[PDB]
Curated annotation (Swiss-Prot):
Top-level taxon in the UniProt lineage: Eukaryota
Residues binding Ca(2+) 2, per UniProt: D25, D28, D78, A79, N80
Domain notes: The N-terminal C2 domain associates with lipid membranes upon calcium binding. It modulates enzyme activity by presenting the active site to its substrate in response to elevations of cytosolic calcium. In the presence of phosphoinositides, regulates phospholipase A2 and lysophospholipase activities in a calcium-independent way.
Protein name, entry field: Cytosolic phospholipase A2
Outcome of substituting D28N: Impairs phospholipase A2 and lysophospholipase activities in the absence of phosphoinositides. Has full activity in the presence of phosphoinositides
Species annotation: Homo sapiens
Disease entry from the Swiss-Prot or TrEMBL record: Gastrointestinal ulceration, recurrent, with dysfunctional platelets: An autosomal recessive disorder characterized by recurrent gastrointestinal mucosal ulcers, gastrointestinal bleeding, chronic anemia, iron deficiency, and abdominal pain. Disease features also include platelet dysfunction, and globally decreased eicosanoid synthesis.
Gene: PLA2G4A
Tissue expression from the record: Expressed in various cells and tissues such as macrophages, neutrophils, fibroblasts and lung endothelium. Expressed in platelets (at protein level).
Domain C2: 2-107
Region (Phospholipid binding): 2-126
Places the protein is found: Cytoplasm; Golgi apparatus membrane; Nucleus envelope
Effect of S96P: In GURDP; uncertain significance
Subunit field text: Interacts with KAT5.
Amino acid sequence: SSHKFTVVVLRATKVTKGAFGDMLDTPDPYVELFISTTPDSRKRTRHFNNDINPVWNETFEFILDPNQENVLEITLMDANYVMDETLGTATFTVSSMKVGEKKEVPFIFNQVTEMVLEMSLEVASS
Ligand SMILES: [Ca+2]
Ligand SMILES: [Ca+2]
């Protein structure tokens, strides 16, 4: 049928570009979501200036087809003046979740920065 996949982009901790990159520019972070198997899905949070432990608490909704191999692509970004830098990329295969389930999935980027997401899967179609 059609499922409502809710992603709450909660927070990240110890966002870093490395020692040198952080001395040039303290990360100005945001998260970007993308699920290629659903129409205009690219979504993203607001960025925070010079914040290595950003708290977004932003809720995103994706209407998915359960026949597709739906993989949530999560990118931790740094807002820059010329070109935003991708500090890391994670994938979340929605198959791992079942309708009715709601769970916290933490992702670790570069074995240093933790990004916490809350996922929810429902059968929904109001
Ligand atoms: Ca900055
Ligand atoms: Ca920046």
